[PDB]
Nucleic acid binder design. Structure first.
Lengths: 66, 50
DNA sequence: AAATGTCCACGAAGGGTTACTTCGGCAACCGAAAAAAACATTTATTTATAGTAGCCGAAAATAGTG
DNA sequence: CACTATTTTCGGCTACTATAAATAAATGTTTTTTTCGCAGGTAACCCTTCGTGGACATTT
RNA sequence: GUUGCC
């Protein structure tokens, strides 16, 4: 995303005024288009006391590990 | 003329034009609020109902 | 000499500038920004409880198909 | 009538949850101070400039 | 304080 110029027959060695600035959203919109779309069911978001608290499920130990 | 088109003609037939058609033409003119910080976040409005 | 060259001040004309437009009565109703400072939490480690709560999960069990 | 087929359910296993108490260290969050924000309606009436003529001055 | 009306 460096600056780009071109060579006109009228004015040679002229630099593009639109490449001087960057949009900072076209790059973000490419990946956001290529994300999965899902329809939110307001029942799915349910939350309890076991929410937003660190700690997870430990994978139980095997005798090969012992 | 007054049976189907009454006495309050100017007051109701403008508000009935507002709620059905005139609201979609406003969300389509102020859509896609953006944040320059964290540029991949966008809220856009698809329709509006009352 | 004297006539013209010049310089000077009062007045003329218009220039934009500033306080102006009843008398009653009833209802009401309403700067920001860096720095300095203080101080709680997270950071462990116990070591005793019961409760959620999650994830599993296997095995108890009624049920679904041939 | 019977081995399935997924389910129902316990079930034990684990992971936090206040509790007091030590640092020592680091972090993260918020008042209290000390301190400069860029062009590079009508009518007097007083106000200003235009104009015009005043006498000194200096040349002829 | 602000509007409405006679």
């Amino acid at each position: 995303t460096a600056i780009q110029l071109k060579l006109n027959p009228d004015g040679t060695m002229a630099i593009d005024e639109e490449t001087m600035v960057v949009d900072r959203h076209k790059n973000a919109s490419i990946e956001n288009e290529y994300k999965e779309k899902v329809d939110e069911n307001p029942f799915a978001n349910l939350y309890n006391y076991g929410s937003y608290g660190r700690g997870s499920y430990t994978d139980p130990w095997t005798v090969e590990e012992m | 003329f007054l049976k189907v088109k009454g006495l309050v003609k100017q007051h109701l037939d403008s508000f009935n034009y507002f709620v059905d058609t005139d609201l979609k033409k406003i969300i389509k003119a102020n859509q896609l609020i953006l944040s320059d910080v964290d540029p991949e976040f966008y809220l856009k409005y698809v329709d509006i109902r009352v």
